[PDB]
Amino acid sequence: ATFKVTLINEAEGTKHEIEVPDDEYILDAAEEQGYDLPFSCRAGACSTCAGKLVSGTVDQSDQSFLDDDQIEAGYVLTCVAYPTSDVVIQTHKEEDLY
Ligand code: FES
């Protein structure tokens, strides 16, 4: 499968659509399609690439930084997240975490 991922940057007022293989991380596909996004470790072990789901699902089992509550709230580490449906996700959400 190849899923539609809509990237929303709320502070900048942008909406960007990409197509993401079910076996590619969101961050890599965004970059390839011309949308650079924040990151640092690229390994699921920081908060730099955090996003927050609006709709749809991911498999971010490779992640380690987020706690279960944060995941429940919809936070995703985009560097290690595979889409498992069409997704709408807010980017640039690191500052929401504590
Ligand atoms: S860039 Fe560190 S968890 Fe994604």
DSSP 85-98: S-EEEE---GGG--
Task: Decide: 77 and 50 in contact? Cβ < 8 Å.
Answer: yes
Determine the distance separating the centroid of ligand 1 and the alpha carbon of 2, expressed in angstroms.
23
Experimentally determined by: X-ray
In sequence order, the 6+-apart residues with CB closer than 8 A to the CB of 27 are 37, 39, 42, 49, 78, 79, 81
User: Closest by alpha carbon to 53, among 83, 17, 21, 14?
Assistant: 83
Phi, psi of 6 (to 5 degrees): -105, 120
Domains of the chain: 1-98 (3.10.20.30)
Closest atom, ligand 1, to C-alpha of 45:
3
Residues with a CB atom less than 6 Å from ligand 1: 39-46, 48-49, 65, 77, 79
